[PDB]
Amino acid sequence: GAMAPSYRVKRMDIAKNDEECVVNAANPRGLPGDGVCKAVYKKWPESFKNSATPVGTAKTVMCGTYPVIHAVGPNFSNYTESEGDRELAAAYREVAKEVTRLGVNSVAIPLLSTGVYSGGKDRLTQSLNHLFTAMDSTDADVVIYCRDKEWEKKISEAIQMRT
Ligand SMILES: Cn1nccc1C(=O)NCc1cccs1
Ligand SMILES: [Cl-]
Ligand SMILES: [Cl-]
Numbered sequence: 001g002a003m004a005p006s007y008r009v010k011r012m013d014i015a016k017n018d019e020e021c022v023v024n025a026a027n028p029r030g031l032p033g034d035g036v037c038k039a040v041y042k043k044w045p046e047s048f049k050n051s052a053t054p055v056g057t058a059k060t061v062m063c064g065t066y067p068v069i070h071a072v073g074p075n076f077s078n079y080t081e082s083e084g085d086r087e088l089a090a091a092y093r094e095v096a097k098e099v100t101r102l103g104v105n106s107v108a109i110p111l112l113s114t115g116v117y118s119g120g121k122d123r124l125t126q127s128l129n130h131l132f133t134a135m136d137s138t139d140a141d142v143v144i145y146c147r148d149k150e151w152e153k154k155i156s157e158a159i160q161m162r163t
């Protein structure tokens with residue numbers, strides 16, 4: 001575990017993370033995809049060998065010894081708000097199980113279902129709160145990666161509020 005488990009947020013490409021493993025915002029088919037997924041495909045393409053997994057699940061594949069946790073959030077274009085909310089919560093719970101299983105002291109994690117799977121809605125708070133619900137019982141340092149300057153501020157505020 002980390003000596004004093006923390007949450008942090010950085011506004012930069014998660015392919016440049018300084019953590020012991022990464023969470024991919026994957027598609028269910030293990031395709032290269034777009035946004036975070038495409039960045040992860042560029043950096044760790046070996047990790048997409050048999051990475052396909054259903055919605056609401058996480059599947060870890062090594063790139064060398066570097067774990068890539070493929071976490072499949074729901075596409076809110078296809079799910080009802082209710083069912084999507086349940087699958088988004090479930091994907092983060094599976095991430096917390098994988099992070100624990102791997103024994104890492106740190107993890108880089110994007111906000112699932114906030115990009116092209118958001119169904120055109122701002123889901124920062126929904127996705128971040130499900131992240132916290134899952135990760136709070138883990139002792140890994142969690143570093144959340146985002147690209148939007150306003151999101152960085154809001155994620156940072158949400159973290160510092162609970163400290
Ligand atoms: C941190 N990062 N590295 C590369 C691209 C991004 C990013 O956060 N993009 C927006 C998305 C959030 C979830 C799916 S796409
Ligand atoms: Cl960058
Ligand atoms: Cl997304």
Ligand SMILES: [Cl-]
Binds near residue numbers: 146147148151
């Ligand atoms: Cl963002």
